[PDB]
Amino acid sequence: GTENLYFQSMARLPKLAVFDLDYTLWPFWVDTHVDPPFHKSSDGTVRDRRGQDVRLYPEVPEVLKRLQSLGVPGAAASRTSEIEGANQLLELFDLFRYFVHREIYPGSKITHFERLQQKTGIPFSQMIFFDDERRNIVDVSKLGVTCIHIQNGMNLQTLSQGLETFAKAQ
DSSP states (O other), X not given: OHXXXXXXXXXXXXXXXXXXXXXXXBSSOTTTSSOSOOEEOTTSOEEOTTOOEEOOOTTHHHHHHHHHHHTOOEEEXXXXXXXXXXXXXXXXXXXXXXXXXXXXSSSOHHHXXXXXXXXXXXXXXXXXXXXXXXXXXXXXXXXXXXXXXXXXXXXXXXXHHHHXXXXXXX
16 A cells, blocks of 8 residues: 555665765765865866865765755764864755764764764664774764764665664654
């Protein structure tokens, strides 16, 4: 039936997709490997104050568009010390629209997740989380979040695999 297909499809999806920043959305540490502030050049390339190029992993825009097409809102959770620079990159890559709720500061990821739950009201069991660091996957899984370990940046295959893992885990 049409309503059954619709509601079953809705129920299989996470209610929040949480992303780390460094090595998840972009291939570097924002507090170490680049020299802020940043700007977008006339050719459309974002660069740091020494003229070094800064970009997202190539499939990140498509990944985030796909989540949006599925109705899954986003959040950011990063321990970077370069908070201003991280927020400037979110602006320059046109990602603030997707990442409404953000915990960007040094600290425990368990603290980040507590604060994201407060800001969104979403139970941990209805969250999915993508992170390059296995230790974060181990820790945040203890809260009941479905945690997907990233290798070599976020991409479409990782998103697909993650969503299926989440759907099976219910």
